[PDB]
Amino acid sequence: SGFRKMAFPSGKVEGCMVQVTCGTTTLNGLWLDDVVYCPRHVICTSEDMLNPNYEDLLIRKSNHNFLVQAGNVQLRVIGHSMQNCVLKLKVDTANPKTPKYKFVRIQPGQTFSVLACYNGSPSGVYQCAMRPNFTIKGSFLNGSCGSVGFNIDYDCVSFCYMHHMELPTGVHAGTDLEGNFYGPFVDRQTAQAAGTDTTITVNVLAWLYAAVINGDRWFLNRFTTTLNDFNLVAMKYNYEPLTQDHVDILGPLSAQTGIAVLDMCASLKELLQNGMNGRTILGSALLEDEFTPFDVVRQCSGVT
Amino acid sequence: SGFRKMAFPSGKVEGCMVQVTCGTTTLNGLWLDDVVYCPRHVICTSEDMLNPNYEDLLIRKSNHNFLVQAGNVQLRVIGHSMQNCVLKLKVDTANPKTPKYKFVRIQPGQTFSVLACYNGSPSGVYQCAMRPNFTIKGSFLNGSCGSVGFNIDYDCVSFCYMHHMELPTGVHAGTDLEGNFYGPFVDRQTAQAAGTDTTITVNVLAWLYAAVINGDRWFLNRFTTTLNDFNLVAMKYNYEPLTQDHVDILGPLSAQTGIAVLDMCASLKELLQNGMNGRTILGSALLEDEFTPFDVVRQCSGVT
Ligand SMILES: O=C(Cc1cccc(Cl)c1)Nc1cncc2c1CCC2
Numbered sequence A, B: 001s002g003f004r005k006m007a008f009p010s011g012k013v014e015g016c017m018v019q020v021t022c023g024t025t026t027l028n029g030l031w032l033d034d035v036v037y038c039p040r041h042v043i044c045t046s047e048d049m050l051n052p053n054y055e056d057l058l059i060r061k062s063n064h065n066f067l068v069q070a071g072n073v074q075l076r077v078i079g080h081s082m083q084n085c086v087l088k089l090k091v092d093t094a095n096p097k098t099p100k101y102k103f104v105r106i107q108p109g110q111t112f113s114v115l116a117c118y119n120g121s122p123s124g125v126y127q128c129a130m131r132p133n134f135t136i137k138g139s140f141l142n143g144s145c146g147s148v149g150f151n152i153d154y155d156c157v158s159f160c161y162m163h164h165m166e167l168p169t170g171v172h173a174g175t176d177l178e179g180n181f182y183g184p185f186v187d188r189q190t191a192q193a194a195g196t197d198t199t200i201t202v203n204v205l206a207w208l209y210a211a212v213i214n215g216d217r218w219f220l221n222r223f224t225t226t227l228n229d230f231n232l233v234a235m236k237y238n239y240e241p242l243t244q245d246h247v248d249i250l251g252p253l254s255a256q257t258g259i260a261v262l263d264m265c266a267s268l269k270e271l272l273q274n275g276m277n278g279r280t281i282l283g284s285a286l287l288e289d290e291f292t293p294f295d296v297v298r299q300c301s302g303v304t
């Protein structure tokens, strides 16, 4: 038993991290096969970050301007291309440590592990969610750009996020591995609206099921609700509307605990309306929404 | 910016994990150099776990009874010895992936990362603290025994914990890598008192400094206190007494923020006496004590 904000083991991703330097800027790159992926703003100086014309800036750069270092050894750059907001540096050597991998675009509300890196070296790993507003609440300092988000299924690493920017609000924005920003964000030093965030209702419910599985049951009540009644409450509290797709994904947890999804929704409704009354659930004093139903089942089953 | 419950990158430890089977029991082992370390209860069946005579049970076992598998390949056991509650299986092959390592006994209140494993395969990584009562609040299922806790300084892995047992209370107990249990626990299927836990005051204060560094300042007040006045409040709220050693370790954070340690203590005093009033600090609705002052400085500086 026990429930933690557990990240995937980071080894497979650590072996892909490289340092990419261009001019005066250094950031992280992801070395998979014979390609190094990194944020395209590596070609910028602070001065042109206000309104960069990436196409014009990249034209002044040749393969020899991109210094790519893997640990203590230098990689030879034989090609460079810009795909959306990422650069793809073709190197003459395939990464011997390339795991089985995929590039996936996660949906808002999904979770993933982040391996924060500086100068191509890993510093830590943490689990987080793609917020409904497409930002992530990470922990990133200057130099962390190019750090990636991922999920692991058995031996396959599905890369979903590449860190690019921190908004003035202190929240984080980035792209999928094709360089497409999640959300409306642009790679420019300009104030950008993240937009209204919401609580990921299906995840809170999954975490309430995790709480029951791990012994915390004080919040279980004698009530039930309907999707429509529950969604009126969810709207009032800036929670995402619950759909039958969400109920369907909560099926395994409902079967595991014997608590019908709408009965758990009624517990959530009462917690939203009355608060926790100074009590805790799985060591938290708020409703946690960074565990998907898949995460709860995985952590409670022991998938390696 | 941003503050997360960040674990160390787990790659160096993943390369050490092996599966150890003895009779009908399978658990995790730690392969460093030519030795495999695992909990000694691997030699037990459920029947003798009630009151095991480990010395007598180990006598019925020979090197060939300990099946050690590293991924898909089998290790040849050439020696076996029991050191306290761990078994040391000498194998004929040194682990090629052995990182620079140390065995350290952490102090209560210190933190470390845990790589949860099943059948010698890693499933996840999470950060946790050694509680003042020497238990850890981990996330572990049946088969997780032998999973280890560690810290990383540059390239050196300091192993501090080996998972052994889950108490009836749902909390976790284990040993250092010399097989010495942290706390009063014994490796027996018997109800065992964990003892009164306390909140790690120095860690809460470090986390309050992390909050200020990352922008959350609502809790800062116009007050100050003394160590004696603060400790009267700490006693009332089951917080560990703050000493000058704790104030000294908080020095860097006090200098970074310009907030004197006793002024931060007065903020903590008011938060303890008045609660959060429905507000949050670094996304938490309670006072977090699982970040040491070292962890806050590391996460806010980017040590790789
Ligand atoms: O935000 C940036 C640079 C940047 C500026 C404008 C646009 C773009 Cl794409 C990137 N770097 C960053 C990332 N995560 C975290 C922290 C930083 C700075 C300090 C903390």
Ligand SMILES: O=C(Cc1cccc(Cl)c1)Nc1cncc2c1CCC2
Pocket (backbone or CB within 6 Å): A001, B041, B049, B140, B141, B142, B143, B144, B145, B164, B165, B166, B167, B186, B187, B188, B189, B190
């Ligand atoms: O506690 C045990 C077995 C055991 C019994 C008695 C003494 C000793 Cl040393 C070990 N295993 C375990 C560890 N972490 C987590 C979970 C389990 C069972 C299920 C969850």
